[PDB]
Amino acid sequence: MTVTEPVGSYARAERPQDFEGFVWRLDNDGKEALPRNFRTSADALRAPEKKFHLDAAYVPSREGMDALHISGSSAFTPAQLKNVAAKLREKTAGPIYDVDLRQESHGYLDGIPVSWYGERDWANLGKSQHEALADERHRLHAALHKTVYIAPLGKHKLPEGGEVRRVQKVQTEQEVAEAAGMRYFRIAATNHVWPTPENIDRFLAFYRTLPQDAWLHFHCEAGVGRTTAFMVMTDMLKNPSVSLKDILYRQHEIGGFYYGEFPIKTKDKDSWKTKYYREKIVMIEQFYRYVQENRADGYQTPWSVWLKSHPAKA
């Protein structure tokens, strides 16, 4: 009769009540000067990771990379963001945006970057961005002058060690970004899965009206999955004549994930990730198709509407 959840919306079938947040997770221990997986579109391409079984001899086209003006990284401490801002300012004189792609509630407690972690990092699964942000503001404010437990995850993604402290200061990422001289833009994307149609519609609208010399610094928790997906989408939108192969290879060779087909291998405990990786591969190709078919008329129809009439196939 009718499909309940179409390709690209698999996560909608999961139950949010089974992944509610339970601890303040430490996002970065702040020992390094910069966040992890820091990379920009001006960087040199390096050898591909063996896990993706790609052609190391292949030389991807760099067409349009000099004007792409994007970067990516993991989460960061306030000091690390300032170092990022300073490095990016040496590359551009345009506005620098901190594009926060995290749906999970996060912020800073006494300057320490933390996020309200639920199993699979799905504590805000199913919430609208409005609802997620409200949860985030409420949780951060409720921590002020209260005792909290902050810990890094260890064996089996469960707390291990950490610290206990009575919070004297709370800040949102928006505040920390503005303190580093960056503009802020939030897209609440769920970790480990393809961004929702509303996530992408929001990004495309924001992208279309950006200043010509705008620089976009994308980031998620670790700086791999969600960050690379949006870097790839921006590359496709700005350089539509570049082949899909070149886009996927170059975004991976500067330090990101490889969004093409490859032998997916997961440990038994991570078997739930397998189908979401397969979905991402199919959706990447579908987004490329959307751009090729709708750029000519200036995107009169958005991704969400187009996708409903042109469903992806597994």
Report the distance separating Cα 253 and Cα 87, nearest Å: 20
Tell me whether residue 278 is annotated as binding: no
Instruction: Spell out where the chain is interrupted, by the residue before each break (C to N > 2.5 A).
Output: none
Contact between 89 and 146 under an 8 Å Cβ cutoff? The reply is no
Q: Is 118 annotated as a binding residue?
A: no
Q: Can you tell me the distance from the alpha carbon of 313 to that of 150, in angstroms, rounded to the nearest whole number?
A: 42
Q: Is 226 annotated as a binding residue?
A: yes
- Tokens at residue 81, please? 């963001």
Residues in Cβ contact with 86 at an 8 Å cutoff, skipping those fewer than 6 apart: none
Q: Is 225 annotated as a binding residue?
A: yes
Instruction: Tell me whether residue 86 is exposed, middle or buried, using C-beta atoms within 10 angstroms of its C-beta: 0 to 12, 13 to 18, 19 or more.
Output: exposed
Q: Is 97 annotated as a binding residue?
A: no
Q: Comparing C-alpha atoms, which of 21, 28, 22, 19 is closest to residue 221?
A: 28
Distance between CA atoms of residues 235 and 244, nearest Å: 10
Q: Is 277 annotated as a binding residue?
A: yes
Closest CA to 123 of 256, 20, 237: 20
User: Do the annotations mark residue 157 as ligand-binding?
Assistant: yes
Question: Which residue, chain included where needed, has tokens 């500067």?
Answer: 254
Q: 143 labelled as ligand-binding?
A: no
**DSSP three-state, residue 181:** coil
Angstrom distance (rounded) from CA 39 to CA 290: 27
**Annotated binding-site positions:** 25, 157, 192, 221-226, 273, 277, 280
Annotated binding-site members for 1D-myo-inositol hexakisphosphate: 25, 157, 192, 221-226, 273, 277, 280
